[PDB]
């Protein structure tokens, strides 16, 4: 059986090291890789190390350990909420901006602590570990999980045992994402993870610099999926102790906070060497304590944090655009864009919240739609630089004609993008209303719905703008001038 797993991992490494198969064959490849992974997983015994107690049986130890090492442990308690899972709940009133959580550096798991641990020897030799701090943290987690007297045992014993990252989805749950923007990144995550498991399985079972690792006795695919999912859903960037560089870290106790809309209120205090969190809003006793994770899209939250966030005010989709080399005006348009600090082709964003396009995308679309004489006015003479400076400003159009053209283009492009999905908004809403679904399936369906709702909002906005600027052109109103 040891020889059998080694050969299955060899085949998996070869399969997942193959070049990209082409976007049209990525689903086929994904199913093929899943088949190999699931065959390996069913031949293994799950997580190599499991604990006897329930998850909540270990939170008292987490609190004592954090307390002994200088962290805040009063004013909150751990509660298993249905929607978010375990999180923190206030036991007293906490006022907005109050410093209520702090975590000294000695409690953290960092790239630096990974190097100085039992992983150190293999880290010092393996090019991938040295280049990929996130992968290093995952093996740091696994090595300490498998070490009976690890300093971080109270943290590791309170981590979840399962996640809702796409690595855990059923095939049919991922199938809901066919034809979306997000599914390519799900394919990549799966292939990356399986390739990494197969590579490190071989390294650990043969290489001498890994001879002393606790993972030589047992290193299962489930172990690795758990480890990378733990890191991706909760890792943080912090400054190094001298504050000159940045590093990746897991931050115990504070990382139990769940997400809500707002602003980042967690920062590193270099002088006192600890993470510090101030209250994002008022929390009354009995309310869940939330933080704002960051301005990530629902794609990023699903794929990398394992959840979908309703009413994510930072949600967005990608839109790829560029000036065509076949444009008679390419040279002038590319020069205007270069002077404005915008590339000639790029992946932009469409946003759910107003305004749907950024200053950069507005500037791009204005140039994309300029006439030769407008381009000359942005290239020549003593007002050309002033004209460049306003290109991102909605209040100062190049011309009414330019606006009608660019909103007409965006309306048409967003409408076209909507037609490339395998279901409609109305159909997705019917699915969510009329079918009974798992959490994971709902994540996938809400993600594909969300992509389309952003496109549909852009269509409607572009149509309103087009009609506004058409009327200004009909009335030949005087153009605004920036003063």
């Amino acid at each position: 059986s040891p020889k059998e797993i080694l050969n299955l991992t060899s085949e998996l490494l070869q399969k997942c090291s193959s070049p990209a198969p082409g976007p049209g064959k990525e689903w086929e490849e994904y199913v093929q890789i899943r088949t190999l992974v699931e065959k390996i997983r069913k031949k293994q015994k799950g997580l190599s190390v499991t604990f006897d107690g329930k998850r909540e049986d270990y939170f008292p130890d987490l609190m004592k350990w954090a307390s002994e090492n200088g962290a805040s442990v009063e004013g909150f308690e751990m509660v298993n909420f249905k929607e978010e899972g375990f999180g923190l709940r206030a036991t007293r009133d906490i006022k907005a901006e109050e410093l209520f959580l702090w975590v000294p550096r000695k409690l953290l798991m960092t790239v630096e602590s990974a190097k100085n641990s039992v992983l150190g020897p293999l880290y010092s030799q393996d090019r991938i570990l040295q280049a990929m701090g996130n992968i290093a943290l995952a093996f740091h987690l696994l090595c300490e999980r498998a070490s009976p007297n690890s300093f971080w045992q109270p943290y590791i014993q309170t981590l979840p045992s399962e996640y809702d990252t796409p690595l855990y989805f059923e095939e049919d749950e991922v199938r809901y994402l066919q034809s979306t923007q997000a599914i390519h990144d799900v394919f990549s995550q799966y292939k990356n993870t399986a390739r990494q498991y197969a590579y490190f399985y071989k390294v650990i079972q043969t290489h001498p610099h890994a001879n002393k690792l606790p993972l030589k006795d047992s290193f299962t695919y489930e172990d690795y999926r758990w480890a990378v999912s733990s890191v991706m859903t909760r890792q943080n960037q912090i400054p190094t102790e001298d504050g000159s560089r940045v590093t990746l870290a897991l931050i115990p106790l504070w990382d139990m906070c769940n997400h809500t809309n707002g602003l980042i209120t967690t920062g590193y205090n270099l002088e006192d060497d600890r993470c510090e969190c101030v209250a994002l809003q008022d929390f009354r006793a009995g309310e869940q304590i939330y933080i704002f994770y960051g301005t990530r899209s629902n794609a990023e939250f699903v794929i990398h944090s394992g959840f979908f966030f309703d009413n994510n005010s930072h949600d967005r989709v990608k839109i790829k655009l560029g000036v065509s080399k076949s444009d008679r005006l390419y040279a002038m348009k590319a020069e205007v864009l270069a002077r404005a600090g915008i590339p000639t082709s790029s992946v932009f964003a469409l946003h759910f919240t107003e305004p749907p396009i950024s200053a950069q995308l507005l500037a791009f679309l204005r140039v994309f739609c300029m006439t030769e004489e407008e381009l000359k006015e942005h290239l020549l003479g003593d007002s050309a630089i002033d004209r460049i400076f306003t290109l991102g400003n909605s209040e100062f159009p190049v011309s009414w004609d330019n606006e009608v053209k660019l909103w007409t283009f965006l309306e048409d492009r967003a409408s076209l993008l909507l037609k490339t999905y395998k279901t409609t908004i109305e159909e997705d809403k019917s699915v969510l209303k009329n079918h009974d679904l798992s959490v994971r399936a709902k994540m996938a369906i809400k993600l594909r719905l969300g992509e389309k709702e952003i496109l549909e909002k852009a269509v409607k906005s572009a149509a309103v703008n087009r009609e506004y600027y058409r009327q200004q052109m009909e009335e030949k109103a005087p153009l605004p001038k920036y003063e």
């Binding site: 990356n192 960037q237 912090i238 590193y268 994770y293 990398h304």
Partner: peptide, 15 residues
């Protein structure tokens, strides 16, 4: 205030 903002679950490249 935050010289060093901390983003929970900051997205990284896995290859």
């Amino acid at each position: 205030t935050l010289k060093y903002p901390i983003e929970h679950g900051i997205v990284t490249n896995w290859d």
